[PDB]
Design a binder for this molecule. Structure first.
Ligand code: NA
Length: 129
């Protein structure tokens, strides 16, 4: 599923991401835009042989199992395929563990490089939330 910007903002808010670990909703929407362009089916191979999955490009190196990332972990206890669903519950549940790991949203390099310090409220502008 390719979410609309406000559609994704609504979904993230409902699942309690808005201000989770102090990160306002626009930060999450901004991270999703540059990770996945709001596409739940997005997959990208990393240099290390891990893969990133779904709207928030969650990495098989630590967070989900994909059966092809040797020496990796599954800290969200889910198949990586579950992070490609049209229903973002599993991605949000796992993203809450990631952002709690100690470096906040710096875990998402695209957030640090493209969202951090910027006018992230623009991403929820005009949304009926
Ligand atoms: Na893994």
């Amino acid at each position: 599923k390719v979410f609309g910007r406000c559609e994704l903002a609504a979904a993230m808010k409902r699942h309690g991401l808005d201000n989770y670990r102090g990160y306002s909703l626009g930060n999450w929407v901004c991270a999703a835009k540059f990770e996945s362009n709001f596409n739940t089916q997005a997959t990208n191979r990393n240099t290390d042989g891990s893969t990133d999955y779904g709207i928030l490009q969650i990495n098989s190196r630590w967070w989900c199992n994909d059966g092809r990332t040797p020496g990796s972990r599954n800290l969200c206890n889910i198949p990586c395929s579950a992070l490609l669903s049209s229903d973002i519950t599993a991605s949000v549940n796992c993203a809450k563990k990631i952002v709690s790991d100690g470096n906040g949203m710096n875990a998402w390099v695209a957030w640090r490089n493209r969202c951090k310090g910027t006018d992230v409220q623009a991403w929820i502008r005009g949304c009926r939330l």
